[PDB]
Structure formats: structure tokens, C-alpha cells
Design a protein around this ligand. Structure first.
Ligand SMILES: N[C@@H](CCCC[NH3+])C(=O)O
Ligand SMILES: N[C@@H](CCCC[NH3+])C(=O)O
Ligand SMILES: N[C@@H](CCCC[NH3+])C(=O)O
Ligand SMILES: N[C@@H](CCCC[NH3+])C(=O)O
Ligand SMILES: N[C@@H](CCCC[NH3+])C(=O)O
Ligand SMILES: N[C@@H](CCCC[NH3+])C(=O)O
Ligand SMILES: [Cl-]
Ligand SMILES: [Cl-]
Ligand SMILES: [Cl-]
Ligand SMILES: [Cl-]
Ligand SMILES: [K+]
Ligand SMILES: [K+]
Ligand SMILES: [K+]
Ligand SMILES: [K+]
Lengths: 292, 292, 292, 292
């Protein structure tokens, strides 16, 4: 499933930075019960950078196992080296995942032609649906609509997580692609506007802690009931912003701990513990959302 | 040492994308002959992103072997996961490399506290000198002077490659650190300016193909002969700019090939071959520098 | 009238840079016939900067006279000095204009409090409806939604021309103001997206030469027929962009001359004649729109 | 002359917002006493925007009178309409002012060709020396080095106030113009750096309240005593920054008042009185500089 509220799920960790199966199970049961459309496993919010390839694969396989067919799972498979991306994708072929979320290469700043060749190569060697992922603030490069248009002609490149927050991209891309290409926001604070302009859903950080409201908001949006969706959005907006008061996923992991959804808010370096000022800001945003 | 013209050396590859020893040997001999002060092995220009950890170490060890004590070798050791950075650093402990060049984590956007803890942890697991590396356009993260000041208090954190091209950083950092902390430009087009403001050298892409000019320019700068150095800078300025006409190291590898310095200009995806327009642009810049 | 397609009308000039009454009449008759909602007289596209206060007032009074009650006229009354703005407004009190369009002070970069006091003062000394105008790329300052919210409580501050192209501003402002506050795009290329998000119209440069299509597009948008409006938008999009290939109003004046709507494309310094390359680009955009 | 510490002088006003001669006289005497090299009258810090043309000329003539040949006076003559700039310039022809400071047109965003024609036209209507002024953050327009080079070929275009804070401009412009073209900083925080790179002085806001320190710092810089000059710069750096804590000249006028240099800190709308938090911030900065 590639519409509605899709959770960019945290990788819950114990005090030693190892994946906490009990906490992960609780999260997955929570999303099943709360109407989340799908789970993105080991994406940006899942600390993809600080898990090695084996750990990365373990978390995805564990998420699939715990999901037990009750909610679709999309694997984070992005890499800044084309060989690494292909290799990661091969690990998940025939795993039970429904799709892959694959970010533009970061740090090395490839050309648009390089992005084309990167994603074409990755798509060539799997039958899995591929969701492209653009987030220039993180990567140093910007996958432009023209190139998204080219890539969409590849059979199994079926959508994009557009995280710029630049809302003009919705219809610039939509115009260049077929009607079944999925446009998904990757920016919680502008996600409702993104849907109102033609987007089909959101891959959301806020959904980790406001799953039901996010699910309802996205359904109302899909139905054209924007004023109704916007009331929900207004109560989530502090959360949409303040979950980034310190680097994601620091705030959202702390929020999950505070709600009792995970056992510890531990991360891996270079992420560090939430500051006291950060706790207060996030707590206030949670209360505004009606969650505490 | 950590002064003068330091080359950000390409990793020359054969048509299959593997390191070409003959070409690497030719490059290192050229830098020895040219007066290059040191070599950064498997930095950004050396395609650190698309070499796996073992391949990366092999290239560094090969470069060190081929240098044969004639020219100091600095290993690229940056990673966006602290555990990976430590592991990479540990490979070169007691190896013969004189220091490490280590980039702020990319993609995951750590806070300034995260940068502090990341670089501190790394420095603690080695006796090797550490040169911090800031390049926000690639990483999505900006290591600020205040934090550089904090880190410079760690015994073996001894310098910074400052690639912002924001020249106010030179004196902002200099006032926060001791006189023996090295300030190196990571931006060829502004490097002479950077030196004129008190910088000690440059980790250069241009030096790959104009090693003798670059070495001489940095010498003049160190001696305070800025007008003289500027004449060289002006001859080199088209290269400083046009070596980024397409994503580095696509242009510089082609230039190396054109100059007969390497056998092939092959790269690894997502870097792709230089365009015809790029070739013509880079060739004109080489002609302007009097290298062709 | 403060909804639909509102034309940011050119001030047509003879070869000596003086207002050309015959050309102005032709433009005004064209907008009456073509379904334009209203005319903004001596706004940005009308060369407000290079008309002295007397010339400025003359053009507005002439536009009113030629309009002869067939189409509403809004006066550009913006100034970067509060006294100048008030004084300009007093000239038009009881003139027959329906409203004023008043830009944030430019060059002097006032605070949000200064913007508040500026616009409050101006509104205090007229009964005329006031439309605020935000265009940071021109002015060096940015009227934020919070301050728009404050100002909207002033009886006769009734809307905003939001020209950032930042589409998040639509609902950030809408949430803070009453349901009858008018939100108008000041960015042709993003104007349809702006309306789709809740905006009520556009103060348009493109409307100078594609009046009928703009009128229909905005009506379809107001009716919720976005896919239909978007077909029209796609054929105007080259024009939306290329009317800014050289500084506005250089391209649009040339376009009006080429269509026979005005006698000469003359401007005042510091605007200068369109380049040959500019003519070709604009001509191609006109043909794409079906206008030549 | 057009060298050293040049004050961007405030236009001190009485409570009614009109120029206060006694305060202006006190300021000019202070600059004479302090070693300030020249005064810019009714530049940006002098509230050029909110003085009408006659009021502006009166302030310039008053300043010139009060200077009484003891200190050179440069008139602010910029305008965004070329005809206005010429007219303002013509007021000071054969007056005793030694030159004009003329800003790129603001708001209307002319092309580089428009800048060329605007400044050329102005220079042609005067014998007075012309200092170009680039400050894109206020104007929406950026006068590039190439165009500065073009204009420097005009006999009486003799310098630039470069307020971008982008230090690469110093040597980019210097290589395009003759050795007697003056390079002046318009950015206090980076001005010493600007001078260290080859700039000849600064048109300073800080100099309003720290005239003696600024003059001495620029003298040391001109003599190549940069380390010595930096000690002064560091004492002044909080002022360099915090005089922009609220929009200039709100902070500097309050500082003048606090120091007893002017009778009131009154400004004209849209500038508004300093906030209490602003006062405390500016006072700490003055204390740091040892002026309080
Ligand atoms: N830290 C590296 C390797 C990731 C390993 C798989 N999750 C990166 O962010 O690309
Ligand atoms: N970058 C490699 C990818 C091969 C796939 C290996 N897992 C190439 O050029 O073919
Ligand atoms: N592609 C990964 C791993 C690099 C491995 C060592 N060169 C990264 O850029 O972080
Ligand atoms: N050129 C000045 C005066 C405008 C006179 C009235 N249109 C400005 O742009 O503010
Ligand atoms: N800026 C003036 C405006 C007065 C209106 C004169 N036309 C003030 O503070 O009152
Ligand atoms: N406020 C107008 C006119 C200034 C008149 C002379 N000081 C402007 O800033 O252009
Ligand atoms: Cl994700
Ligand atoms: Cl490097
Ligand atoms: Cl307008
Ligand atoms: Cl000034
Ligand atoms: K497809
Ligand atoms: K140290
Ligand atoms: K109102
Ligand atoms: K000259």
C-alpha cells in the first residue's frame, strides 16, 4: 500500500543501541490498530546510517515477522553507491516486503544523468516497486521533476517521497508522469498542503506518535475534505515542527518513550540524547496534539 | 605535512572500476616531482562513497606503499556513523599514514553536540592527527567555529579543511584555537584568499592536474608574496571553477586522462562519464592554465 | 472586486517615456472585453518606481477615466516611508478607485512591528480597502503570517498579494484571518497551486497578454475544477516563467507591443530594452500560449 | 578621502522626527576629534528612505556646513529611478561635498545592463567622484564584479562600497579595475577581513559610536598590522553584530543616545523604537567595547 499515512518508523533500541524487539512489536501492533497504511522500515527516521547492512536487514526482517501480514512493510534501501543499493535490494527480494524506498545518493552529488542511471540500475534488478526519495537538505542533491519523469517510465519505479517542502513540485511532477504514479510527502508540516495539491499520502515522522489522527487526516484529504483534515492538521502542527527541534529521530524517539510505546529513547552516535529544553518543547507539542 | 598544496587525489580506475596501480603510481611520482606537500588518499575526490571499506583501505595502503616515504599520506576516514569512522580509523593506526581527514557526518544531520561527540570519540581511538572537514553543501551539516574551538582542545585534533568558501570562517576559527591549529581551504577558487587571511594551505582538486603551479602558489602565499601568487591563481582560475562544471571528480579524472596522467577516466556509479560539452569546457580551462 | 484574474497592468509609454493614453485605452478595453476582474494601476509591473508622485497619480486617474466604470481599478499606493504612503493614499481618496495595493517597505528592512505600525497608520487615514503586498525578493523584507494576522483585525485591511511563491503561506495566513480576508497570488507560475490551496485569485503579469485564459483559469479554480484549470495553466506556463527572463516589465511590454496592444515597448531607466535573445524566448512562450 | 574609517552617520532627530542640529554638530565634532576619515551623509544609516528630497539635501548641506572643512563629506545620492538619482546628484554639484555614494536601484531589480546604464547616466551628469554601493539584501539586486569592471572605466566612477559580506568579491573586483579604484567594506563584522584581502577602508555603522577604535583599527590595517587591528576588532565584534539586533539604524541611534552623543533616538516610520531586549543587548555590546 502506497497511499495514506505511511509511518517512517523508529528503530527502537535498548541502552546498548541494539534493536529492541519488544518495543518494535508494540509499535507495529499500535500501527495495525491505529489505521496506518504501511510501515517504512529502516528509512531516515529508522537510523539507516548507523545500522550496518546486516543489522539493517535484520530490522527489516524482524518488522516483517512482527507485522505478520497485518500491515504492509516497505524497506529503506537507499545508498550513495549504486552497488550498495542493488546489493541491499537483493537481500529483500522475495522477503515479503511490498516495496522499497530509495533515496538520491547523498554526499557525492551526482548529476541528473547519474541519478537516472543509479535508479534505473537499481530498478532493473528487482521486481519490487521502487519509491524514489528526494531530500536535498540531507543529501546535497535535488532530483528534479524532469528526471522523475524519465524514471517513471521504468516499469517498477512507481512513486516518489518528495521531502523538499517545495509544494510546486507536486504538479510539476504530476504533469510528467502517469496517473498511477504515487506522490507522497516527506515533509510533515506541509504534507496536508501537498495532498490538497494532488499528493496521495505522506511518509510521516509524526505518525509514529499520532497514528490515528494522521490516518484520519490523510483519508479526509483523499476524499477532498480539506477543511476537516486541516482541523486535525492544526492540532498536529506543533508536533510537525517540534519533532525536528533537535535532529530527527531524537525528538520522536523521546516522544515514543514518554508515551510508553518504546522502552528507551536510545540512539546511535552521531545522534545524542535529547536536551532538557527539547523535552519541554516536545512535551508541549504532544499535549497540544492531545496525546499526553 | 599539514601545510602548503595538498592534493585531494583521484582514485584512478581501470575500465572495470577498480584501482589502477600503474596510474596511481604515475600520479604519486608526479606529485613528488611537482613539490606537492602531501596526499589525501580516498577523500571526496578519491570516490570514498563508492569504495567499500576494504577497497578503501587497499587504496590507502597502496598509495602509502607507492609514496615510499617520499611524500606524506593523509587517509580519508570520515563516516556518518561514528562506529564506522572509528573502525576505518583503526585500520590505519600504526600504518605509516601521517594523519586522517574526517568529514562531518552526512545525511543524518547531527547537532553541534553530536559533531563534538562524534569527533571526540574518533580522536580517542587513535594516536593519529585528525583534520576535521566541513562541507555543508555535500553533508547537510555545518560544523561551526565555536564547535571547532571545542574540538581543537582535544590533543590530536589539529586542523580543519574548511570547504564552505565562506572566508569569514578563517579568522572566526583562528581566534578560537591555538596558533598551531592548521587552517586549510577546501575550496580551490577561494583558497588563495583563504591563505591571504591566515590559512596555512589547501586540500586541492586543482592540484591533481596543476600540481607544480599549485605548490608554487602556496609557497608564495606562505612567504607573503600575494600579488605574485595571484598571477598563478588567475592562470588557474578557470580550472578552479570548471573542474566543477560537472560533479567532482568527473572533470578532474577526464583532465588527468587528457594529460596522460592516468590510463582511463572511469568512475563508479552514481558518477557518470563527462559530457562532450564538459570535455570542451575542461580542455579550454587546461589550455588557459598552459597545461595543454 | 478582489477575486479572480486581476491584471498588474503595464504603464504604456511613448518613445519619450511618457504615458501613452491611446495604448492605455486599448489595454483597458481589452481587459473589459476579456473578463479581467480588476486592474491594478501603477503597481510593480506599472513602473511605480520611475513615475514621480504626480505622474503616478495621473496614470491612476487616467486609468479610472478610461475604465469609465466598466472595470474596477485598484491603485498601487506602496511606499518605503510611511508618510509617503499616507500621502499617496490621500490623493486617491474619493477618486473612484475601489481599493489600494500597498507593498511592504523596500530597502530599509523594517521589523514586523514596523510593518504593523506602517500599515495600521496607512489604513487609519482612509476608508479605502487595503491589500497588503509581500514580495521579499524585491524588498528585502518578509511580512510573516503572524503579522498579517494582526493587521487583518484592522477593519479596512482586507487582503494580501502574496508573491513569495512559498505556497505554505496560503494556509498559514488563512488560519489566522477571517473567512472574508482575500488571499491573492503575486506569483504567476505558482498562482494556480495557490488558488487550489485556498487562494481567491491572482494579481497577474501574464494577464496583460492572456487575459481571457487567465480569467477562465481563475473561474475554474474558484469552482474547484482544478484539472480543467491546469490544462490552461500548462499552456501559459512558459509565459508565466519567461515574462521574467529579463526584469519585469521588460518582457511583458515587448509582448504587448508584438500583439499590437501598445504602440511602443519603451520603459524608463533603470529598465532597458529587451535583448534579442529575450525577444526569441518570449515570442516562443507567446506561441506556446496560442497568442501569436 | 575614500580610505580608512568612514562613518555611515545617523541623521539625529528631535522628538518630532526632524533633524536636530545640535546633535548633528556634536556628532561631527566627535568624528573630527576621533580621526574619522570622512562622513557619508544621508546614506542607509542616515534614513535616506524616509527623508524627502528637500529634507535629504538640507541634512547634507547642514552636515557640510557643520563639518566646516575639517572632515570630508560624501553625499548619499542613490535612487531606484535614474532620473531621481541624477536630480539628487545635481543638487550637490559645486557644493563642497567630495563625492557621492550611490546604491544599485532597489525594488525594481534591474539587469546588469540596467545597472551599467543607470550608473553611467548618473556619472555623466556630474563631475563629482562616484562610489558604487552593492547591498543585495536590501535591494533585491546584485552588482557583479564584471559590471563593476565595466563601470570603473568611466572616469569619475572611482570606488565601491561592497556590503555583501562575501569576501571573494574583494579580489574578484580588484583584478578587473585599476589600482586606484577604492574597495570599501559595507559590512562591519567582516570589514577587517575585507581590508586584510586588499580593501582600502570601510563605510561603517559601528564608527557612529566607536569612532576612535574604528579609525585606529583601519590605520593598523592600512599599515599591515593585522594582528594588532584584530585585537580592536574583537573588542568591537559584539557591536558589529548587535547593532543589527534590530533593523539599522534603530540600535545605533539608541547607542548614540545612551552615549550622550545625540539628544533623542527618534526615527521615522517604518523604523520603530528599540525594544527593551534590544537596549539590554546593545548596552552589553557597548560595555564589551569599553564605551560604557
Ligand atoms: N553509514 C553508511 C552505510 C549504511 C549501511 C546500511 N544501512 C551510509 O549511511 O550510507
Ligand atoms: N556499480 C556497478 C554495480 C554492479 C552491481 C553489484 N552489486 C556497475 O557499474 O555495474
Ligand atoms: N557508501 C557509504 C560507505 C563508504 C564505505 C567506506 N568508503 C558511505 O558513503 O558512507
Ligand atoms: N522611486 C521612489 C519614489 C516613487 C514615487 C511614486 N511612484 C520609490 O520607488 O519609492
Ligand atoms: N511618519 C509620520 C506620518 C504623518 C503623515 C503625513 N502625511 C508620523 O510619524 O506621524
Ligand atoms: N522613499 C523614496 C524616496 C527617497 C527620497 C530621497 N531621500 C526612496 O527610498 O526611494
Ligand atoms: Cl523514511
Ligand atoms: Cl578530500
Ligand atoms: Cl502589482
Ligand atoms: Cl551608507
Ligand atoms: K512506472
Ligand atoms: K589539538
Ligand atoms: K479586516
Ligand atoms: K574610473
Amino acid at each position: 500500500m502506497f497511499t495514506g499515512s505511511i509511518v517512517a518508523i523508529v528503530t527502537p533500541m535498548d541502552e546498548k543501541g541494539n534493536v529492541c524487539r519488544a518495543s518494535l512489536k508494540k509499535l507495529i501492533d499500535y500501527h495495525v490498530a491505529s489505521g496506518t497504511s504501511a510501515i517504512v522500515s529502516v528509512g531516515t527516521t529508522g537510523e539507516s546510517a548507523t545500522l550496518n547492512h546486516d543489522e539493517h536487514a535484520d530490522v527489516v526482517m524482524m518488522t516483517l515477522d512482527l507485522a505478520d501480514g497485518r500491515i504492509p512493510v516497505i524497506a529503506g534501501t537507499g545508498a550513495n553507491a549504486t552497488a550498495e543499493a542493488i546489493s541491499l535490494t537483493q537481500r529483500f527480494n522475495d522477503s515479503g516486503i511490498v516495496g522499497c524506498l530509495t533515496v538520491t545518493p547523498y554526499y557525492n552529488r551526482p548529476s541528473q544523468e547519474g541519478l537516472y542511471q543509479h535508479f534505473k540500475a537499481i530498478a532493473e534488478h528487482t521486481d519490487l516497486p521502487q519509491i524514489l526519495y528526494n531530500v536535498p537538505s540531507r543529501t546535497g542533491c535535488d532530483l528534479l521533476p524532469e528526471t522523475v519523469g524519465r524514471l517513471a517510465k521504468v516499469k517498477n519505479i512507481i512513486g516518489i517521497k518528495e521531502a523538499t517542502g517545495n509544494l510546486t513540485r507536486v504538479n510539476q511532477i504530476k504533469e510528467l508522469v502517469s496517473d498511477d504514479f504515487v506522490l507522497l510527502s516527506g515533509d510533515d508540516a506541509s504534507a496536508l498542503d501537498f495532498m490538497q495539491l494532488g499528493g496521495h499520502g505522506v511518509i510521516s515522522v509524526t505518525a509514529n506518535v499520532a497514528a490515528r489522527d494522521m490516518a484520519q487526516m490523510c483519508k479526509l484529504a483523499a476524499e477532498g475534505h480539506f477543511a476537516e483534515a486541516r482541523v486535525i492538521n492544526q492540532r498536529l502542527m506543533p508536533l510537525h515542527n517540534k519533532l525536528f527541534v533537535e535532529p530527527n529521530p531524537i525528538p520522536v524517539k523521546w516522544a515514543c518513550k514518554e508515551l510508553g510505546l518504546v522502552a528507551t529513547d536510545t540512539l546511535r552516535l552521531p545522534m545524542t540524547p535529547i536536551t532538557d529544553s527539547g523535552r519541554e518543547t516536545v512535551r508541549a507539542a504532544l499535549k497540544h496534539a492531545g496525546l499526553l
